[PDB]
Design a protein around this nucleic acid. Structure first.
Ligand code: CL
Ligand code: CL
Ligand code: CL
Ligand code: K
Ligand code: MG
Ligand code: MG
Ligand code: MG
Ligand code: MG
Ligand code: MG
Ligand code: MG
Ligand code: MG
Ligand code: MG
Ligand code: MG
Ligand code: MG
Ligand code: MG
Ligand code: MG
Ligand code: MG
Ligand code: NA
Ligand code: NA
Ligand code: NA
Ligand code: NA
Ligand code: NA
Ligand code: SR
Ligand code: SR
Ligand code: SR
Ligand code: SR
Ligand code: SR
Ligand code: SR
Ligand code: SR
Ligand code: SR
Ligand code: SR
Ligand code: SR
Ligand code: SR
Ligand code: SR
Ligand code: SR
Ligand code: SR
Ligand code: SR
Ligand code: SR
Ligand code: SR
Ligand code: SR
Ligand code: SR
Ligand code: SR
Ligand code: SR
Lengths: 156, 172, 337, 142, 132
RNA sequence: CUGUGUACCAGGAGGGGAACAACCCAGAGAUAGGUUAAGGUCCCCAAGUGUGGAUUAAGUGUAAUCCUCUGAAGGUGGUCUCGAGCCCUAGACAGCCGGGAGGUGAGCUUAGAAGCAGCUACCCUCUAAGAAAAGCGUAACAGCUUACCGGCCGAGGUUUGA
RNA sequence: CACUGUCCCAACGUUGGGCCCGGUGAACUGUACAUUCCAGUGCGGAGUCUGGAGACACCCAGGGGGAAGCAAAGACCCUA
RNA sequence: UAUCGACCGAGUGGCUUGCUACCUCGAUGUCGGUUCCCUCCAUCCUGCCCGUGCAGAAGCGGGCAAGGGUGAGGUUGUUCGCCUAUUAAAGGAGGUCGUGAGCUGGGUUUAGACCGUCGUGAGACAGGUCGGCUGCUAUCUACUGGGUGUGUAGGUGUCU
RNA sequence: GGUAGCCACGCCACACGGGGUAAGAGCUGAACGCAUCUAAGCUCGAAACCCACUUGGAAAAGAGACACCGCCGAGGUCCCG
């Protein structure tokens, strides 16, 4: 199904699992990447900031995450970097798949609501920003236009 | 912005609306330098290119106008000359100047001669496997040269294996 | 998925109405190249016969062999070039400037136009030459007329008049050539313009066929099989789609078919002569006997017998001229049979 | 011919639309206007885009017909008609008391209307009515 | 193809049954296609004296029957016109089976053959007994 | 499709919006003069071809609202404006000319590998420079280069943010 | 299998109409206006509204594109 | 990155299908075909080009481009599709899924009848099967052809 | 069996070349000293565009041009074959 069907916050928050059942698992493999054994004690901290409020399905969350991290293997399988996708897909989404009769939909997926300006991804690295390219690929697979933002780096 | 081109001593420059004419011993050339808000004039023994505008687009043309005029000075004095060679592998290619156009016969074995008309007072002198294109107007000369190389253009087959043709060997 | 198919008939010969002038009016002339000279002539159609010719195509396998060729016999007696009309170039194309006439007119030209009794051939010629000096002179054409009295097979005596452009070298030499031709009395012959073996465009008003339906007039199909028996034998399927709600002029409809002007490109002139060598035994059906100045045009020529046809040096020939073909035989066998 | 014009305008190097606007304005004021040198009037912009527009107008049509002029004569007089209520008596009158010419058939040199002139030294992206006509296929009578 | 040297009014169509003027074991041939032909809507693809056609064997030895083969039209009933105007027509419609290289497949040809066919398939003509 | 609050259409003229139930002005006795509203002032068509200034070259645009007026993700040395860091008349940036040198063909490896297959180390002379060689190139060499230095030239250049 | 214009692909001809003239002489249909065309708009399928384009009037013959043509208060479907 | 190309993401079309129930129930005739006319381009062929895992020949992929062309046949009512031989190629789509006051009437879908299934039965079936009707003299408008008048403002002829 | 006539199944005719472009190949050329097919300029280049060719066309309301004849008579109508 197209992102067109769910990218907008056009429905009330539907996340209570005590009342919703049969929610598909998440396609997002991990939320912590890189040397997650270590702390965010790095020199440079870049982040991908979404420019529009939107709902991002776990479908796109996993494609963007892979697209970025997989590429961040320009540093090495066990390289010296950190990477965190900080949002979780809490919104349960449905699809009415009798025409418009009794059309409440059936759970078909989950998405993460992200407001304009929130950062969806954050990386921590040493002056080794192959990450800015990692996000160019990441922002390439999520609905909104985004802006890559270096948070702590005067090391031009 | 304004630029001033000191004109060579054997040369003479004259304006006429938007047209400029440069005359030296090697002949003369007349061009047209028409762009918005760019005045080109002959003050005494210097050519001036000026404009009140300074935007990227205006500055671009000013620089182009300059080279065009310095090229004209050079054309009417030392003249312009491009060198060429005819390289064939199997079929003996015959290159000749007949009238006001160069004719290439038996190219790659063809029965029909290929030909290109020469541009302006450009003279094409052929001597053996070498050709030399020369004249005061670089535009007219440059084209003629290129025109000859383009005349042996080949799209159908693999160029790496079929290289017969007249190529430009020397650029001024 | 309905197979493709070209449309029925050409949209380039319309509207398909009756011709305005039974006499053809060329709408183009040859290029100015050779010496000056009238660019056209005219005659009356008599009929057809065939001829045996020695193939003369240098690229033909049959070069030098007998070859039968259909031919249309055109009676082409001498015409009269009675005036020299000049055109001037103006902001609205060309316009007739003035004319130069003669004194000697055919005894029966008074059946068509009002023959001049008081004219000034110099006042006119002067105006023309002044114009040429100013550089406002568009081409020069000769008012031309036939002498159907020289043709017994044609009932009419009333001449057919038509303008024919003069082309040639320089406008000056040309204007002088034109003026000489007129001054004389005007008389000139097919010989003067054409040579056998050259290509000429023939114009003429085709045979008239009154009103005819879509099938014959546009070449549309006749209803087929069962469709041909339910009440519609030769009526097109539909006048058009629902929308646009109107009948386009492009859908084949009944009407005037025939009696239109047609200019037939590149017709080979097989032979120019005079006498009765090409006549047919019993006479050309619905015409009469030929015995005078005539022309043999290869192939067909628009119009029925007796209709005035016009000649013009081919304007877009495809072959080079092979002058004076060798005519080994000219059928004189009766056409009745 | 003979057009006793009260005003003779010189369209040479003038914005066609801007000239047409004033000429209509005057014809409606009772003035008899003669526009001269139409072939030399101009219209600003990209020649390629401008020509596409005038070529499209030539292609449009059907049985009812959409006759569109190709010579500077008509392109201009049509332009003026678009600024007049020609289907009305008052508007047809004005329009009819207006004629456009190729070159100048008069002895007087026409006048140049204010604001309508284009300065060739400051502009390069513009086209001549004559150039449109030639591209549209018209027989260069001028 | 090389010019015939005569004008031809196709006397056959897709579906026509004709004689097999040779000794290949095929007695009757059915025209299926005309090499190099493209007709127009609703028109039955036609064939005539001189054309190369694809054919299926209708009558003949079991071994030849049903085989789809190429052939050349050698004779036809509808008249043809020769350079000198004379018309020429035959008693029947016939075709000689021919191979990939246009050589007759059979050893002998039966009946006359138009001289015109020689200007294309010479090997066929040079196996003819009578050439008219 | 189905709620809710409200004003409107329905049952609301007249002015505007090309036309146009509910968008804008406006709520309206007749008649008259005047001044405005919305919306307009190049012509069609009443009023500006108004003023100071900037941007745009695509006819972008000349389209408030909208079933009705599209234009997106992704890209842009198109162009205008603003800012930050750094280099620069002790001569920058680019171009052109010249120099690019010895130990040494480093050692190991290997038949061989000599800047450049691999591994390891990556040193010192001359000097204004010149890598235990960044990129081609050879079977390997060679050869072209380039880092680096000097000259000619002479004014801004370069990097990044909005 | 045989045969053939069913078809390729249409042609010519025959008789009766059709067309012109004398005489006779209805019906269907009609809110009005009406020379339209391309677009748009509008209850979303306009000769009549908007913007353009085109348009001198009247008459003869024609084949029927449109008048969501004319004909019968849809017989399908739902509702009572 | 010749070529193929998953995931995910952004769109355009209005050709399929679905949804809605705005228009029409004092009627806008249904599928397919046929005939005849116009068009669209997301191009199958033809013209001119670029790249190649381009020697050539031939392919493969891409670009401009809608002038022209895109046909004949076997089963089936078919649309679609499968199949055969030809072909430069035998492209797709819009026009009330163009076209019944043009045709056809094979399919659909009345009244007769049989079979299977279902039903106690009448009878039914989003199953199959045989049979089963196609009205009208054109008022306006539209176009194809033909005339009579008026305007421009005596006549003939030729032209633009 | 077949004349005329009408017909096709018969027979005749239906370019070459200019001009301007697209994709593309290039020249000169700056912004940006170099480079650069492009920004100004230019040389080329499609069955496509324009012309060339054919057909219609003085009701083109700017309702056209030329020549001659005529205004007591040019020309036309009716009539007749
Ligand atoms: Cl039109
Ligand atoms: Cl400009
Ligand atoms: Cl076939
Ligand atoms: K209904
Ligand atoms: Mg006869
Ligand atoms: Mg005979
Ligand atoms: Mg068919
Ligand atoms: Mg009510
Ligand atoms: Mg006003
Ligand atoms: Mg726009
Ligand atoms: Mg009702
Ligand atoms: Mg395309
Ligand atoms: Mg190849
Ligand atoms: Mg339909
Ligand atoms: Mg209908
Ligand atoms: Mg019906
Ligand atoms: Mg009827
Ligand atoms: Na038009
Ligand atoms: Na149908
Ligand atoms: Na096409
Ligand atoms: Na089929
Ligand atoms: Na319908
Ligand atoms: Sr909602
Ligand atoms: Sr339902
Ligand atoms: Sr995005
Ligand atoms: Sr159809
Ligand atoms: Sr003409
Ligand atoms: Sr019937
Ligand atoms: Sr309609
Ligand atoms: Sr004004
Ligand atoms: Sr202003
Ligand atoms: Sr201003
Ligand atoms: Sr709508
Ligand atoms: Sr909008
Ligand atoms: Sr965008
Ligand atoms: Sr009728
Ligand atoms: Sr396109
Ligand atoms: Sr192709
Ligand atoms: Sr099927
Ligand atoms: Sr039926
Ligand atoms: Sr009047
Ligand atoms: Sr280009
Ligand atoms: Sr008139």
């Amino acid at each position: 199904k197209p992102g067109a069907m769910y990218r907008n916050s056009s429905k009330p928050a539907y996340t209570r699992r005590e009342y919703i059942s049969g929610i598909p698992g998440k396609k997002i493999a991990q939320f912590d990447m890189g040397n997650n054994g270590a702390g965010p004690t790095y020199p440079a901290q870049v982040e991908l900031v979404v420019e529009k409020p939107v709902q991002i399905r776990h479908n796109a969350l996993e494609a963007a995450r892979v697209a970025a991290n997989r590429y961040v293997q320009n540093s090495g399988a066990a390289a010296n970097y950190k990477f965190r996708i900080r949002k979780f897909p809490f919104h349960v989404i449905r699809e009415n798949k009798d025409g418009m009769r009794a059309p409440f939909g059936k759970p078909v997926g989950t998405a993460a609501r992200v407001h304009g300006a929130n950062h969806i991804f954050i990386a921590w690295v040493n002056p080794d920003p192959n990450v800015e390219e990692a996000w160019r690929r990441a922002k390439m697979k999520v609905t909104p236009t985004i802006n890559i933002d270096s948070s702590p780096a005067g090391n031009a | 912005p304004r630029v001033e081109l000191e004109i060579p001593e054997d040369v003479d420059a004259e304006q006429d609306h938007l047209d400029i004419t440069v005359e030296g011993d090697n002949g003369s050339v007349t061009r047209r330098l028409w762009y918005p808000d760019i005045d080109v004039s002959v003050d005494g023994d210097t050519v001036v290119i000026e404009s009140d505008e300074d935007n990227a687009k205006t500055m671009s043309t000013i620089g182009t106008f300059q080279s065009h005029i310095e090229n004209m000075f050079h054309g009417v004095t030392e003249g312009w000359e491009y060198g060429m060679e005819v390289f064939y592998s199997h079929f003996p290619m015959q290159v000749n100047v007949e009238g006001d156009e160069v004719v290439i016969e038996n190219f790659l074995g063809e029965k029909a001669p290929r030909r290109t008309t020469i541009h302006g007072d450009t003279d094409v002198e052929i001597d053996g496997e070498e050709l030399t294109v020369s004249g005061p107007d670089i535009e007219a000369v440059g084209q003629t040269a290129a025109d000859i190389e383009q005349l042996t253009r080949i799209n159908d087959k693999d160029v790496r294996v079929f290289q017969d043709g007249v190529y430009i060997t020397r650029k001024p | 998925p309905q197979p493709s198919r070209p449309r029925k008939g050409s949209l380039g010969f319309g509207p398909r109405k009756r011709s305005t002038s039974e006499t053809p009016r060329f709408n183009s002339w040859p290029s100015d190249d050779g010496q000056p000279g009238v660019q056209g002539f005219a005659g009356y159609k008599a009929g057809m016969t065939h001829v045996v010719l020695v193939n003369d195509e240098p690229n033909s396998p049959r070069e030098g062999m007998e070859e039968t060729v259909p031919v249309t016999v055109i009676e082409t007696p001498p015409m009269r070039a009675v005036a020299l009309r000049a055109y001037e170039d103006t902001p609205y194309g060309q316009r007739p400037l003035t004319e130069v006439w003669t004194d000697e007119f055919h005894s029966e030209l008074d059946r068509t136009l009002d023959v001049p009794e008081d004219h000034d051939p110099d006042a006119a010629e002067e105006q023309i030459r002044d114009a040429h000096e100013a550089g406002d002179l568009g081409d020069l054409r000769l008012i031309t007329h036939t002498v159907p009295d020289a043709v017994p097979s044609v009932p009419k005596k009333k001449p057919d008049v038509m303008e024919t452009r003069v082309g040639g070298g320089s406008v000056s030499d040309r204007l002088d050539h034109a003026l000489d031709i007129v001054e004389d009395g005007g008389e000139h012959a097919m010989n003067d313009i054409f040579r056998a073996g050259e290509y000429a465009d023939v114009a003429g008003v085709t045979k008239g066929k009154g009103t005819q339906g879509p099938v014959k007039r546009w070449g549309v199909q006749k209803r087929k099989g069962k469709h041909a028996r339910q009440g519609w034998r030769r009526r097109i399927g539909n006048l058009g789609p629902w929308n646009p709600s109107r009948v386009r002029s492009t859908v084949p409809q009944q009407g005037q078919t025939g009696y239109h002007q047609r200019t037939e490109l590149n017709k080979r002139l097989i032979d120019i002569g005079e006498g009765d060598e090409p006549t047919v035994d019993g006479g050309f059906v619905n015409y009469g006997e030929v015995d005078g100045p005539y022309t043999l045009v290869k192939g067909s020529v628009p119009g029925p017998d007796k209709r005035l046809v016009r000649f013009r040096p081919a304007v877009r020939p495809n072959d080079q001229p092979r002058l004076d073909p060798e005519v080994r035989y000219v059928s004189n066998e009766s056409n009745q049979g | 011919a003979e057009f006793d014009a009260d005003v003779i305008v010189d369209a040479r190097d003038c914005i066609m639309g801007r000239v047409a606007s004033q000429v209509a304005e005057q014809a409606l004021d009772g003035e008899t206007v003669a526009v001269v040198n139409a072939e030399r009037a101009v219209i600003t912009g990209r020649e390629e885009q401008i020509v596409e527009k005038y070529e499209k107008r030539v292609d449009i049509g059907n049985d009812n017909g959409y006759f569109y002029p190709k010579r500077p004569d008509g392109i201009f007089k049509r332009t003026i008609r678009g600024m007049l209520p020609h289907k009305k008596q008052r508007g047809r009158e004005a329009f009819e008391s207006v004629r456009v010419y190729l070159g100048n058939p008069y002895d007087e040199d026409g006048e140049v209307l204010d604001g309508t002139s284009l300065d060739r030294l400051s502009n390069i992206k513009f086209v001549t009515l004559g150039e449109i006509s030639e591209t549209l296929g018209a027989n260069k009578t001028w | 193809m090389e010019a015939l040297g005569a004008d031809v009014t196709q006397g056959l169509e897709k579906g026509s049954l004709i004689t097999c003027a040779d000794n290949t074991g095929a007695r009757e041939l059915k025209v299926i296609s005309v090499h190099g032909y493209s007709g127009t809507k609703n028109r039955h693809p036609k064939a005539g004296l001189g054309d190369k056609i694809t054919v299926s064997v209708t009558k003949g030895t079991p071994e030849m029957r049903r085989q789809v083969l190429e052939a050349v039209v050698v004779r036809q009933r509808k008249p043809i016109r020769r350079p000198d105007g004379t018309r020429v027509k035959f008693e029947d419609n016939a075709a000689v089976i021919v191979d990939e290289n246009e050589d007759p497949r059979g050893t002998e040809l039966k009946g006359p053959i138009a001289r015109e066919v020689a200007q294309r398939f010479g090997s066929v003509a040079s196996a003819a007994t009578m050439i008219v």
